[PDB]
Write a protein that binds this DNA or RNA. Structure first.
Length: 48
RNA sequence: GAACCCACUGUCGUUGAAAAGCCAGGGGAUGACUUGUGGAUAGGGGUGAAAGGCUAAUCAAGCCUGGUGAUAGCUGGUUCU
């Protein structure tokens, strides 16, 4: 206790960030949640 | 009718000897003729016995750099459990 290698954050404080397009297993591979084709699939695809 | 200047027909070549030629024929050949050297005309401009022809193998608007990473409701791609 009270060491630099014995200090931990609270449970639920930190979450891993989501990474798109890094394989089938991740679940967000390939299209990365954008769907298939259309305006919203393109870069900067949101309408005003 | 030779040299010189052209390019009407046919064969060959089409990763060619050649990014436009060779061979056999063909036209002008004292003229509105051919040609060397050095100059002038610059891009919406130049030049054109006029084909949108030519302006460095590039022309219904040359080339280079910059605005610039232009925009693209389109096509493609998007990586471990």
């Amino acid at each position: 206790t009270l060491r630099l290698n014995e200090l931990a954050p609270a449970e639920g404080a930190k979450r891993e960030h989501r990474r798109l397009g890094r394989g089938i297993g991740s679940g967000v591979g390939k299209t990365g949640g954008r769907g298939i084709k259309g305006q919203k699939s393109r870069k900067s695809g949101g309408v005003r």
